[PDB]
């Protein structure tokens, strides 16, 4: 009764969006605003702290843009944290803080800016920016890139932001998005931010649930139960993790049980292969012949 | 008009030698409705240079009445005689540009025997303009 819409004319004139826009992964408006560099700073690249949150992982990369494609400067993953003493809650706000601190220290060691720009040593929850040292190299400057993730006060991305800023990277920001910011009284509560930095919210949840709903405690905080980790000593886990990260931030790749060629050969087994033109011509001939 | 001025054809019945390349071929194509060109034989070149050969010496048209005149102006290009110049023209040599530019544009007379009935149409259609390819020699014999 109505005009069939998906006509050949509809397909012919359709302008497909950008590949990574149809994937729903890249916002090219924000990408244009971030990447584009002041033309009089000819080949000096802008550096993006790309922060991404999966269901199980945190990725924090430092990226500069080029025509052939983006080039990774340094990278830090949440699944690196077990090496530094954090095994559980790898997607906490505090795990995000640890990842940010790790990427900051790793990048600074790669550059050579370790003696200068050590960062906020005594994590207190105060808002503070990496201040340049007079008569010395300016701090590494990085701009946060949250992609399609929504900006809400208390979001985990700004945990990575805070960790990187405390690690010595100069990442410009305002403290009105940290958990602990009072909009009505426009100041940042340092104690609540400090609580969130050292897993205080997770510890409070364990305390509250343990003495109220113990079965949900057994199901949710199982890994802490088998680890004999109480609510009170969680803060020291993150405190030791911070010191360990600041002691040695270098990258240790995981030992791989197979070579690249072995992986390629193993994976190529489960891949269907395209037919020959002759094969599909034979298929068409067979179908016609069996149609009579 | 500009093309004809660059070929130094500034008067009627004026002749010049051109080395064929893509650039000069495209130049000549623009001037085709006004010129007759062809592939000259050796005897045609010799008769032209002997009877009507003049050199450009200090922007002056000087008759080639002695080999000293040719030498004084083309010795740095190893042209020591009228025969050297004719050979450089015929077998287009390394110094063709200098030798051909040294030659003043030849000033032929009207043909003895006339043209065809109507000139300003292509030689294929019974005119005289364009490329005639070996009949340039008969025309030059009429004209020199």
């Amino acid at each position: 009764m109505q005009k069939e819409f998906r006509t050949s004319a509809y397909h012919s004139r359709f302008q497909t969006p950008f590949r990574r826009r149809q994937e729903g992964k890249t916002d090219y408006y924000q990408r244009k605003r971030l990447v584009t560099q002041h033309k009089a700073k000819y080949n000096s690249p802008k550096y993006r702290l790309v922060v991404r949150f999966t269901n199980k992982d945190i990725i924090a990369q430092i990226v500069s843009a080029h025509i052939t494609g983006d080039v990774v400067f340094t990278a830090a993953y949440a699944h690196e944290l077990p090496r530094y003493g954090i095994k559980y809650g790898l997607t906490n706000w505090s795990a995000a803080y640890a990842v940010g601190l790790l990427v900051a220290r790793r990048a600074l060691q790669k550059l050579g800016l370790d003696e200068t720009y050590t960062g906020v040593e005594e994590v207190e929850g105060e808002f503070e920016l990496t201040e340049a040292v007079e008569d010395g190299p300016r701090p590494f400057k990085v701009f946060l890139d949250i992609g399609l993730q929504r900006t809400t006060t208390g979001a985990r991305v700004f945990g990575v932001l805070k960790g990187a800023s405390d690690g010595g990277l100069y990442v410009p920001h305002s403290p009105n998005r940290f958990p602990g910011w009072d909009i009505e009284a426009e100041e940042l509560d340092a104690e609540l931010l400090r609580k969130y930095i050292f897993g205080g919210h997770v510890a409070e949840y364990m305390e509250e649930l343990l003495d109220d709903d113990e079965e949900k405690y057994k199901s949710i905080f199982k890994n802490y139960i088998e680890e004999e980790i109480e609510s009170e000593d969680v803060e020291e886990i993150y405190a030791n993790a911070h010191e360990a990260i600041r002691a040695d931030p270098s990258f240790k790749p995981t030992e791989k049980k197979f070579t690249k060629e072995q992986y390629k050969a193993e994976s190529k087994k489960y891949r269907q292969q395209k037919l020959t033109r002759a094969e599909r011509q034979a298929k068409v001939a067979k179908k016609i012949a069996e149609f009579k | 008009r500009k093309v004809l001025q660059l070929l130094r054809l500034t008067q009627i019945n004026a002749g010049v030698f051109v080395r064929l390349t893509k650039a000069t071929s495209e130049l000549i194509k623009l001037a085709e409705p006004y010129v007759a060109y062809g592939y000259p034989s050796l005897s045609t070149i010799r008769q032209l240079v002997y009877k009507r050969g003049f050199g450009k010496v200090n922007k002056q048209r000087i008759a080639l009445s002695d080999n000293a005149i040719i030498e004084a102006n083309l010795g740095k290009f190893n042209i020591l005689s009228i025969e050297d110049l004719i050979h450089e023209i015929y077998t287009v040599g390394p110094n063709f540009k200098q030798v051909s530019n040294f030659l003043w544009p030849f000033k032929l007379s009207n043909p003895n025997g006339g043209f065809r009935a109507r000139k300003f149409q292509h030689f294929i259609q019974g005119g005289d303009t364009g490329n005639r390819e070996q009949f340039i020699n008969a025309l030059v014999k009429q004209m020199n």
């Binding site: 244009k32 990447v35 002041h38 033309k39 000819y42 080949n43 | 064929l20 390349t21 893509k22």
Partner: protein
């Protein structure tokens, strides 16, 4: 009522290409322009700031100034019996590098590479480009290629 506004007659010149509307690929914003570069001007309709006048659409010039988001291009325009240097400010979305440089810059390096070798080998080499010369003599063999005789065909109506 004659109308001679700024963008008069740009109905097709300032249109986007078919199936090329929308956002600009970021290779445009990543290219680096230096003072003295040769660039082509092509107005992009989707960016109305820093847009050239319709005269400069399709003209080539020299970058002389580089600012935050723009370049200053120099164009020679015929005004009467002489040229006038025009200084146009263009956002880099309307500007592209001229490809005529690279082919010549390649020949500059290629010529030097060939020339220095000829000195090394104790010979000489001629570097000037040459127009396509008339072709030399050749022999056409006819094994399997006995000439086909073609004749004009009779007239025939084909409706």
């Amino acid at each position: 009522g004659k109308s001679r506004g700024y963008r008069s007659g740009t109905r097709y010149a300032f249109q986007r290409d078919f199936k090329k509307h929308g956002a600009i690929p970021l290779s445009t914003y990543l290219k680096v322009y230096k003072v003295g570069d040769i660039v082509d001007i092509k107005a992009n309709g989707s960016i109305q700031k820093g847009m050239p006048h319709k005269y400069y659409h399709g003209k080539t010039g020299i970058v002389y100034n580089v600012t935050k988001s723009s370049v200053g291009v120099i164009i020679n325009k015929v005004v009467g019996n002489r040229y006038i240097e025009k200084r146009v400010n263009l956002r880099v979305e309307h500007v592209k590098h001229s490809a005529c440089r690279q082919e010549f810059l390649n020949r500059v390096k290629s010529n030097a590479a060939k020339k220095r070798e000829a000195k090394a080998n104790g010979e000489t080499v001629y570097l000037k480009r040459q127009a396509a010369k008339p072709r030399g003599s050749r022999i056409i063999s006819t094994e399997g290629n006995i000439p086909q005789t073609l004749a004009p065909v009779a007239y025939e109506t084909f409706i």
